[PDB]
Symmetry: D3
Amino acid sequence: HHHMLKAEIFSGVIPALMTPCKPDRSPDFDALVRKGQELIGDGMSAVVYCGSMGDWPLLTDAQRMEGVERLVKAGIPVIVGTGAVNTASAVAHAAHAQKVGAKGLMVIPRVLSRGSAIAAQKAYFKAILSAAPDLPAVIYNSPYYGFATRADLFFDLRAEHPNLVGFKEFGGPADMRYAAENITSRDDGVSLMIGVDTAVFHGFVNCGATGAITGIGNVLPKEVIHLCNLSQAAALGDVDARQRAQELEQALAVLSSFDEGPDLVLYFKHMMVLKGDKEYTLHFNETDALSESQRGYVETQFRLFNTWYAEWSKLPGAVQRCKA
Amino acid sequence: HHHMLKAEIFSGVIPALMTPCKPDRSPDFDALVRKGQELIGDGMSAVVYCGSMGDWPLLTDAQRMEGVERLVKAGIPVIVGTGAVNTASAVAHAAHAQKVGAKGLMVIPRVLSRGSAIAAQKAYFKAILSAAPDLPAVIYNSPYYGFATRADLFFDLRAEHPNLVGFKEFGGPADMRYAAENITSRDDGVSLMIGVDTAVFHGFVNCGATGAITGIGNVLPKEVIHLCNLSQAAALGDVDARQRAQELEQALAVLSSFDEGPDLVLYFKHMMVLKGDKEYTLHFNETDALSESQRGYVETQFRLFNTWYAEWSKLPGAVQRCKA
Amino acid sequence: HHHMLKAEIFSGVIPALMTPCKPDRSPDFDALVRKGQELIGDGMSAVVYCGSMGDWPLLTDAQRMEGVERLVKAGIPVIVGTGAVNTASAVAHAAHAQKVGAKGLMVIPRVLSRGSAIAAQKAYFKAILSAAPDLPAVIYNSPYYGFATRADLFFDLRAEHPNLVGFKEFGGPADMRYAAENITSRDDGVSLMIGVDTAVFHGFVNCGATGAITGIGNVLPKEVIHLCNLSQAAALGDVDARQRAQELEQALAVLSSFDEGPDLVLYFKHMMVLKGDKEYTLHFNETDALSESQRGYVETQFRLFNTWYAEWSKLPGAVQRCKA
Amino acid sequence: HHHMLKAEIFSGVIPALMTPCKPDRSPDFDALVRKGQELIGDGMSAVVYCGSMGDWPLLTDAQRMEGVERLVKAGIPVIVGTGAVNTASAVAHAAHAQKVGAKGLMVIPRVLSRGSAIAAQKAYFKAILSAAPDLPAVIYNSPYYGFATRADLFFDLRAEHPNLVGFKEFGGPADMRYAAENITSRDDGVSLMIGVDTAVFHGFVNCGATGAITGIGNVLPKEVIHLCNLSQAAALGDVDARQRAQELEQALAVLSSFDEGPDLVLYFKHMMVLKGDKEYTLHFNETDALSESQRGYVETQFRLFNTWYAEWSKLPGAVQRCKA
Amino acid sequence: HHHMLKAEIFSGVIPALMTPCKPDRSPDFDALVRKGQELIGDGMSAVVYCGSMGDWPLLTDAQRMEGVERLVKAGIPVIVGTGAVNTASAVAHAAHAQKVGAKGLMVIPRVLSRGSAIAAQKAYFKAILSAAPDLPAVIYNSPYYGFATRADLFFDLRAEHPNLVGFKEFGGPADMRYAAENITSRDDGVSLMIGVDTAVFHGFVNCGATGAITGIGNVLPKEVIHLCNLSQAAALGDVDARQRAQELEQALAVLSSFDEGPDLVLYFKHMMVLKGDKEYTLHFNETDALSESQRGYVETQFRLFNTWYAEWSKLPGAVQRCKA
Amino acid sequence: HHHMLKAEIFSGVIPALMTPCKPDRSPDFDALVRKGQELIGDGMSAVVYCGSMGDWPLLTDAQRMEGVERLVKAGIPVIVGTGAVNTASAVAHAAHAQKVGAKGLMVIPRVLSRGSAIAAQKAYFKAILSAAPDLPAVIYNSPYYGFATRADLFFDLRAEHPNLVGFKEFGGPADMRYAAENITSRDDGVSLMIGVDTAVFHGFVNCGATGAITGIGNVLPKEVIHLCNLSQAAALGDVDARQRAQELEQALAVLSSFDEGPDLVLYFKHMMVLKGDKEYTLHFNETDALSESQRGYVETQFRLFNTWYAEWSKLPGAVQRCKA
């Protein structure tokens, strides 16, 4: 029985990048790289590409791999998303990640064909893990797939695939607790990663999370790093940070809750536009757009949060200590 | 595409009035008018009559209309409740509201006959709206009716009935969020109204509500206005009010939660009696009364809240700024 | 401990009558009486008036009582529906039933005010039962009311109100079984009544029901009596009837299932029109009507059932023995 | 208001074809065409390609279109499946269907990106319908997508897209009834199609279905046509067929129920192998295979059904009249 | 990979015996043995003692073991129930079963302490299986325990404990199908046992069951054997038996459904009394008794079933062929 | 109608004691008494023995009674747990409690035999209460039993059994509110007891609880007394305590939540070991142990809470006023 360091690539704050559109609605890879570099410069530790935030279903496999290569060539630590329509595609993403020197793998379950069958999932995960043996890997778990990776399966996979060192949960606080209690609190180098924007405090403080993959953090990087830092200080036992982390998470809650729904890319791209990044204006599908009411709601809530934060962020104590 | 002012009648804090009984268990209209005048004097903006709080099912249509006329003649801004056993009655309430110069209409869904049929509801709402074309109207939405008014129906009604300018939700925070995101955050003068006592902070801060119809506010008007003011200041981005509004809402939560259940009129009338308004002693039905345990519970919780509030309400800062 | 005969008024097949409209959309009482007389002549044992099938919420209390008096004066055994917006109305229906010599009382729970409170229901049932002490009474039980009358309450009511001798269940086969096991299979003269059109076989054979209140039986009286007779012969142990009752119930199932939904009066009145009773054309509300697709569906299913029945009803054995 | 003939392409019995593998696990188009021709020769009216039964997610868009072209060139009436990872792909399938002269379009909802958003679905369906204006189209509806096409949306689409003439339901008997009552029983040429193998009798007799898309029918074409014929004769009012259709559906129920689950292609391809079609041995994914217990179960149930059918199919009357 | 015969002890029809009371409410072991011998003489293959039907929680461990020894000494094949308050007791039952020469073991999950923990269940099952290595063993699976034994656990246990050769399901038709598909249809000698009285046809015909443990069969042995024989003939492909088995199961359904509920021993002991076995009059607890209504219901349903059966059982064909 | 003092034995903070093991895995009664004395010395008011925390199912009745006698002889106020496999055992525990001079009775519902039958529960509770007429008694209520004691049953029992003076709820905040509103807020000396570790603030402040039975309090007595004192001061109306009680409850929430699950004794005994009480190392079952991940999780959360508390507990105001 062994004690091992957790994988550095799954620590800290990690945006799942959006893919900006050129005016012709093809990917603007230059703008992708610029945003990635900017977010690392703001204090992010790595990025995830191409995930749901990156519009993976709307892009070809070649386009995703080009985006991955461009990010890696720029010196950005990349965790590669393996979401796919089939095993061959998922494997290809993983093989390409290892080939080009990405630093991590996000292993996404099988969809559309045998989605609920646990035997199918086991084989699919093994195929993906086998294709990038040298890359630390995190498995995504969500009720969306009609199945759950439990401890038995996780440890069976890990016994055959030593690169499986992480677990990322979308499915709610109770599911994250299940993971912390039964999977990720061994001695042995396995990390729980926060996998939805609304679960940051719960993940770091109540579940021993090592890192957070963020949607809203693409828009509000300094504020999301601030929350993550406060939450990590709270996990050390700090009194002041534990209060402050909760205040900030609650103020962020509406804008973070867009990460939970179908329109996450619509909402987050519109927020990028609101803060002056016009390249986030168009979507890959010509008719994908927020409604008039949805745009008004997000604009109102964006303004509210920015106003609150402008004053709250001046408070002495943990608020200052934990800034990015 | 237009920007328009929200209807003033659906702004601020608005009690849904109880109908006091005379000793013979007929309505005491004089006492109704006195309470209405008092609550406006305390800082309420309008009243709702005759709603569920007013015991509408227990009163004749003529009695409700008499109460409405008496309130209007006294100079009180009245939003008229159209709850009814049938379309003809609901229409009559609406027509009477317009005739006598009430300022708003609360449009209540069809019950008892075709309650779950959305085609029935659409026609019923159109009949009611058509009967008071000059009065701003709010539609009530609750899971109790076995159906939900969604954005499609709301906007279809509004296209034919320009007086439909409001939406009032009973069904929980998620339903209120649905309404804010998809219905009430357009540019065009439509208001979300808080429609249950426990949802005040969530409505104003997270959902952009313009006003609150209140049950507990009949009993604790100054305290409920205080909460609404704090919540509205929080919606401006204030740090201190956002903390204080939540403290007050939590202290009020038990007494507000009676608004959620079948015995709301029993509980609220007994609270009116506790604060010295003896005309709230009797109910229209001779056997409707709280149990011994229910009376003890409410008395204990009333005393608790009053004790807490007496000291908390002296705190400096937003607490003082936002008093009625 | 006693053995007593079940109340004759709650035996056999009992239509819950529709209220036909005159062209001005007021009740056609003459047509009501003609239909009642016709259905008794077809083999029905009694009628229920004014129930949900009779559009009670759309009619005034005076109109319902006029319909009741007219039926009673014609010599028809009447079970009076006490559905009401309030206790005073429900009591008035019951008092009027006893005054005019109706033969039974259908006791309907409280709605709109304190609907889910069991203390309210107990008091409401006692008020109604007390108002017609001389009339055998059946309590209606349905999940629609947000509460269930269980054995404890039923027997407590019966101890104070000896006229409570029946139980009518809308809520599904399991609820009917609960009633048979725990309420209606004592020695003591209490009857289970089938209370939804789709539960006839289950009620008579599996639950020991004594009678059936029917919606579809207004339209297809001979066929519904045939099913009830077959089911009762099956309850004697007959082999052939037990097979045949199930075949007929299954063939009737679509048309019977309209009794389960909000549009029951729409569907059943349209079926009355299809068989040539034009006085069932209009509804009390001008806009209540089946859609084009709903009319097509019912017409197709009506024709199907009539075609099947025309041949099936010629079969030898229990089919012939059990005809009305 | 108009009466119009239902589209012939959506009548009768229609297998959703499996894509056989060559030994190299690429599609065997020759074997696909041979099976299609054989099934039409057995009595099937049309085929669906490439649906879930055809392993669409595992095949490239070019491969699906090649299969479609090969079937069409062979003279087989083809309904084209538009299942896709994105709008551009779904549109391409539809455009290709129209280009090559397929006879119908199966319109499959959006997945993976905005799957639950009804605004997204509406736009997606319009894009697909617009791409093949000349082809009769059926929309698939299933709870799997996190949304339901109701009558409002269906009729809104149909008003702009006259080729939308069909509705196919996976979601259970109640959902099929909803469709029959509210969508497909107008006068106007719209067809309900049975969309899961276990719902044949319910669709034809209780819901007025015009045709059935079948999985198990690829394996047992004569037996599935027999059931469909019996069910259609039952829908005419036949007594004997109504009994026999139900006996056959019940005997077929286990083998049909595999159509409901994730392993449908595994189970049905293994059944094809059992009846001597070795080209159905391999799957596109090397590790997709039934377990030892699953193979034993299906083999046992296949043998059972064949034994029962061998004798039952000799019975006189409707059994003989309704054979393929 | 191996083919092996299923264990004979888990084939056929097997009553779970009631423990009759002496007048002092201690067990009447003499009467227990007499009933066991009688039921084997009627055609039962084995018995289960002491299960829930045997009132295990009400008896001491020593009493259960005495009953087991007495049955075994009489020459009756006994499957021993290991239900227990703790591991030590469950192990003791198993060890005693092996010591005295019982023929099988019914392995019952852990309760009261760590009931929902799957790690606890695994260890508990291993402890029980290890204590009787020479006895074929069946694991009971029910939602009552807050957990389910799936294929993974079953096969893991079986790999370490070769005596685990059976699976018994209480939890409904879908759970029994899961077991047939994934656990019990391998080549390798594992048996599915019907474990609730209402699932006989479904188990034998749809799920490949080898045997049935019965409650109602203690009361109606010849009739339950008749149903089991008909169901087994139906599983061979017989047409007539498949019809008849379903008719008999449906006629038996009410009396069988008592096996599903908390009062099973109350209902079944009262039925034993009705057929003249007075030693089934008393229960171990002085106040455990059916209510007046429950006794009336069961008496009515017992009489109904006996009357139906008396005539139905004379029918020619499979009815005669399959009698005990 | 009377006002009466609540029973002192059900006031304050009351650990449900663990039973430590000797190395041979028999109970260490000496260590049990030492811990009981220590916890009373820390500020606890009484103890509960032998409850679920005490491993009751794993111990003989004689062992539990020995533990009870030893605690009572030591001068510790004991509330005796009556959890049992049958009525005779439960009665024996109660009779023994009264015989030896325990101060209270915890009345636990019937399990394993007729668990869901309310008639069985009523009789079982009466048997237990009758056996210790002189001891104040609290009934435990939990969804785990498949039934709920409501006000009707509680007051019926209390009318026949004047020693029934308490109610203890496991089932969640809404169930505790139901109890406060309808059972425990009469004038008449009935106490609500907090019955799960996570419900302390809600019980004292929102529900008028008089005492708390605690699991985590065995490990963290001073901290749990601190929370209870703060919560009781909050129930007086204190502003500062109401804030502080909630901060402490939230910091304690993870460690308290182990009380909600199957592994409560595993988690709490391991925490006792962590604070240096080695006699809590072994469990009665040799294989009952936390997993590696569960041990890591609890150790991390224990350390976190202790670190936070070390600093938070120095704060001025209510924090200091309310220390044990």
